[PDB]
Design a protein around this ligand. Structure first.
Ligand SMILES: Nc1ncnc2c1ncn2[C@@H]1O[C@H](CSCC[C@H](N)C(=O)O)[C@@H](O)[C@H]1O
Ligand SMILES: Nc1ncnc2c1ncn2[C@@H]1O[C@H](CSCC[C@H](N)C(=O)O)[C@@H](O)[C@H]1O
Lengths: 354, 354
């Protein structure tokens, strides 16, 4: 998970990039509710029973509370156009060692929904069948369930020596990450298909590839990852860590294209794609912020870098990292495509529509 | 307001110092099974349709492991009765406690191989925490003796109820006892009112609560009563030693009432939403074991640390419990052979129709 607590070094504080992905997403949520949530004359959405919303990969706030409020307000508005007012039951899902204490203690005091936290991997079932009316998953599905094992094997064609992720040219490494993404995302869709009612909606926001692009190393995320790797190799060359510690390190992430997502969705065959698109990030016009970015990377990578290297490594690594961001300021400010956030609006198919 | 048990899973934590409360749940297993068999009207009942999940809620769950044992007992019993009917539903189990309960520790110790979906619900159970008409089986063990607040009249210097030089009641202080009883009637009624809205017609609620043993009027003749009495005298010993001032003890009181069966029935009749199907006293498994001074002292600290730290500094806990353990030693024979050990009361309630 992300860094816990509500420190200045936490994810409650250094998650503002994902907040703007939520803010321009509000229009995706509002539009999906108004155009595609079939409340009227539909007993699936009977307002005498609760309207159940789930956020998958909710972290610790505040972003999850803004997304949940958006869903609640849109859905409540559509129901009031039919002179109905349901109770809302909102579920916050994340890994078991997500900091749910911090989430619960941050729950908005004036909230008009019932709340629960749901611990467990969303690559598994975490809800009873046929119980979720609106599902939400923002900036979480690029995290794989594991590093694909063959890139950790020295004897494999896919061994990822000297790097910590993929850039898109290493054909064996990229194939391995994609195979892992297919298996993970398929398992996510399998579990969600069982939990989500017929006609229920699922909104997904995920770091991805802009369409047509082959090279992950030409998005922001790809260069940031490439530069985390070279920064670690700088620690190697100073001798502060050994080469083997980096050769054995890999990020468990895959950033899919639209095509990648559609292929898995269509093979799963349980959801119809109602809309797919890119999210124009609000901080698009702003000047590239070398330091703020360094601290957003650290807030994301702290747990996993600390698990593999010492937490000793964080301060000297990210002061090398900031130097490489500054040296690549031009690329990040001007030359990398400023639209790599994809979104999907899915609708659970009826049982006679498969 | 909210005084949860000591968090974490260290050797001073509630999770490692709650063996007496586990004994309560152990002896209650027989009560759960009899209530499911004789009073849970599954067969041909649309309310318990096994195509919908069977929802169980534990109110005052704390951090485990006691809550897991209780929940497993309800699932197994309800499972068995559904099987005898050729059905097999999914179970959705909700763990409710105060917002500042250590839900992280609860979630991290969830039994790995379990046959229910799990969710945590932060919030006071003197309020509504679930949608209406959604819970089929409620459970509440060793929580409902905690009031929502201290009765204001025992804090009033002007009142004959002013609880000077003490932190609870023994039963001889008729004004203090009346105040605590009045607060219990309001709180327990609010609890029942909220559960009545949440529990389905024919749903069961099983309550275990430390109480007044049958035919006993002096709370100080129970283990809990003497433990609180000695915690007050230990505090007054700290006053004598200059470690705390006298006013801080005068102004401190435990927000607890330990009702008799008649106290409980009177509130249940007044609320008029549940029938009492079963009621009695649980035989407690540790009844014949010799009093254990160090564990009892640790159990009390685990329960009281939060509320003691809020009123007195945290600097007061080690000195207070050094004196407390000493006072428990001096009173060994009173706990061992003189206190009434039959103070664990239970209720089986059923939610009434229309
Ligand atoms: N398999 C999985 N199951 C549950 N949560 C997961 C997960 N994989 C990643 N996550 C969670 O997804 C979160 C990514 S940060 C995203 C937080 C929030 N959705 C937002 O928009 O800001 C982390 O909390 C991480 O623990
Ligand atoms: N108003 C309230 N709302 C929710 N939980 C409460 C509460 N008042 C007390 N509690 C909780 O009830 C628990 C009592 S300790 C008992 C825990 C568990 N049922 C067991 O058998 O061991 C504590 O965790 C306390 O925080």
């Amino acid at each position: 998970p992300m860094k816990g607590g509500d420190d200045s070094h936490s994810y409650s504080q250094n998650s503002c990039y994902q907040k703007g992905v939520i803010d321009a997403a509000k229009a995706v949520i509002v539009e999906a509710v108004n155009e595609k949530l079939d409340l009227e004359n539909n007993p699936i959405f009977d307002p005498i029973k609760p309207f159940r919303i789930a956020d998958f990969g909710c972290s610790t706030g505040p972003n999850t509370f803004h997304a949940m409020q958006n869903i609640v307000e849109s859905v409540e508005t559509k129901y009031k156009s039919l002179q109905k007012t349901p109770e809302f039951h909102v579920f916050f899902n994340d890994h078991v060692n997500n900091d749910f204490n911090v989430l619960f203690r941050s729950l908005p005091p004036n909230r008009e929904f019932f709340a629960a936290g749901v611990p467990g991997s969303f690559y598994t079932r975490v809800f009873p069948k046929n119980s979720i009316h609106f599902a939400h998953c923002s900036y979480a599905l690029h995290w794989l369930s594991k590093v694909p094992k063959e890139i950790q094997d020295k004897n494999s064609l896919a061994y990822n020596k000297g790097r910590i992720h993929y850039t898109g040219t290493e054909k064996h490494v990229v194939k391995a990450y994609f195979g892992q993404f297919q298996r993970d995302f398929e398992g996510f869709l399998k579990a969600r298909a069982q939990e989500i009612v017929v006609g229920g909606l699922m909104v997904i926001q995920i770091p991805g590839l802009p369409s047509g692009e082959v090279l992950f190393s030409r998005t922001g995320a790809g260069l940031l990852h490439f530069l985390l790797g070279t920064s670690l190799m700088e620690l190697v060359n100073k001798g502060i860590i050994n080469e083997e510690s980096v050769d054995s390190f890999n990020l468990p992430q895959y950033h899919p294209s639209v095509e990648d997502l559609e292929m898995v969705i269509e093979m799963n065959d349980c959801f119809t794609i109602e809309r797919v698109g890119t999210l124009p990030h609000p901080m698009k016009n702003l000047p590239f912020d070398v330091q703020r970015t360094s601290l957003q990377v650290r807030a994301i990578m702290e747990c996993i870098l600390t698990e593999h290297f010492g937490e000793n490594i964080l301060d000297p690594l990210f002061e090398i990292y900031t130097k490489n961001l500054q040296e690549n300021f031009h690329v990040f400010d001007k030359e990398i495509r400023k639209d790599a956030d994809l979104y999907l609006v899915l609708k659970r198919k009826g049982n006679l529509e498969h």
